[PDB]
Every structure is written in structure tokens, then in C-alpha cells.
Predict the structure.
Amino acid sequence: ANFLVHSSNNFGAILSSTNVGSNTY
Amino acid sequence: ANFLVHSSNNFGAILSSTNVGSNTY
Amino acid sequence: ANFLVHSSNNFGAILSSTNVGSNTY
Amino acid sequence: ANFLVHSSNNFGAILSSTNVGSNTY
Amino acid sequence: ANFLVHSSNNFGAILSSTNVGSNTY
Amino acid sequence: ANFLVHSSNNFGAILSSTNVGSNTY
Amino acid sequence: ANFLVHSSNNFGAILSSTNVGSNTY
Amino acid sequence: ANFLVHSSNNFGAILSSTNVGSNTY
Amino acid sequence: ANFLVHSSNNFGAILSSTNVGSNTY
Amino acid sequence: ANFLVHSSNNFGAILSSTNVGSNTY
Amino acid sequence: ANFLVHSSNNFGAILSSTNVGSNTY
Amino acid sequence: ANFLVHSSNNFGAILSSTNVGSNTY
């Protein structure tokens, strides 16, 4: 899994993630 | 899985993700 | 799976994702 | 799992994460 | 798990994390 | 688990962490 | 002008606004 | 102009604003 | 102009603002 | 201009502001 | 201009401000 | 300009400020 994030003025969630089991947002 | 994100003024969710099991947003 | 996102003024969900099992939004 | 984040003016959550079990945000 | 963060003017949570069990934000 | 953080003007939480059990923020 | 917003999991722009002159998004 | 915002898990721009002249997002 | 914000887990820009002239985000 | 902010777990920019002239974020 | 901020666990920029001229974040 | 800040566990910038001319963060 390749993750690269290059933001400038984000203002908000860059929710770059990965998971097997359960979650919640 | 290749993930690259290059935002400028996001203002919001860039929900770049990956998963096998269950989730919830 | 090739994922590239180059946004400018997103304002909203760029839900770039991938998965085998179940999910929910 | 490859994670690199290069922000400039974030203003917000860069929630770069990874997990097996449950969570909550 | 590879985590590198190179911010400039963060202003906010760079919540770069990883976990098996439960959490809460 | 490899963690390196090289900030310049943080202004905020660089909550670089790791854990098995429960937490709270 | 009455504006009330009660969100739960927004993920995006709640652009509740008001204006006379010009704008741009 | 009445503005009240009661969010729970925002994740994003609650851009509650007001203006006469020009702007840009 | 009445502005009240009562957030719980913001994660992002609550850009509650007001202005006559120009701006930029 | 009435501004009151009562946050609990902000994690991010509560950019409560006001201005006549130009700005930049 | 009335500004009151009553935070609990901020974690981030409460950029409560006001200005006529130019700025930069 | 009325500024009162009553924090509990700040963890971060409470950048309560005011200015005419230019700045930089």
C-alpha cells in the first residue's frame, strides 16, 4: 500500500488510512 | 495499491483509504 | 489499482477507495 | 504500508493512520 | 509501517498514528 | 514502527504516538 | 436571516453564508 | 444575521460566513 | 452579526468569519 | 460582531476572525 | 468586536484574530 | 476589541491577536 500526500492548504481531513477490522468516523 | 493525492485547497474529506473488513463513515 | 487525485478546490468528499469486504457510508 | 506526508499549511487533521481493531473519531 | 511527515505551517492535528485496539478522538 | 518528525513551525499537536490498549484525547 | 446548522459527521462544506456583492468558490 | 453552529464530528469546512465585498475560496 | 460555535470533535476548519473587502483561502 | 466559541476537542483551526482588507490562508 | 473563547482540549489553532491590513498564515 | 481566553488543556496555539499591517505565521 503506497500512500503519499502533498497538500498545500488542507483546511480539512486528509484521512489517508488503511485497516482490516472495523472502524467509525 | 497506488495512492497519491496532491491537493491545493481541500476544504473537505480526501478520504483516500483501503480495507478488507467492515467500516463506517 | 492506480489512484491519483489532483484537486484544486475540493469542497467535498474525494472518496478514492478500494476494498474487498463490506463497508458503509 | 508506506506513509509520507509533506504538508505546507495544514489547518486541519492529516489523520494518516492504520489499524486492525476498532477505533472512533 | 512507514510514516514520514514534513510539514511547514501545520495549524492543526497531524494525527499520524497506528494501533490494534480501540481508541477515541 | 518507524517515527521521524521534522517540523518547522508546528503551532499544534504533532501527536505521533503508538499504543495497544485504550486511550483518550 | 436565520441560520442554524446542527451537523453530526459533516465530511464536507457546510457553506452556510450570506452576501450582497460578488464572491467566488 | 443569526449564525449558530453545533457540530459533533465536523471533518471539514463549516464555512459559516458573511460579507459584502468580494472573496475567494 | 451573531456568531456562536459549539463544537465537540472538530477535526477541521470552523472558518466562522466576516469581512467587507477581499480575502483568499 | 459577536463571537463566542466553546470547543471541546478541537483538533484543528477554529479560525474565528474578522477583517476589512485583504488576507491569505 | 466581541471575542470569547472557552476551550477544553484544543490540540490546535484557535486563531481568534482581527485585522485591517494584509496577513499570511 | 474584546479578547478573553479561558483555556483548560490547550496543547496548541491560542493565537489571539490583532494587527493593522502585515504579518506571517
About this structure: Chain I touches chain G at residues 12 (CB under 8 Å). The first strand of chain I starts at residue 2 and ends at 5. The beta strands of chain I are 2-5.
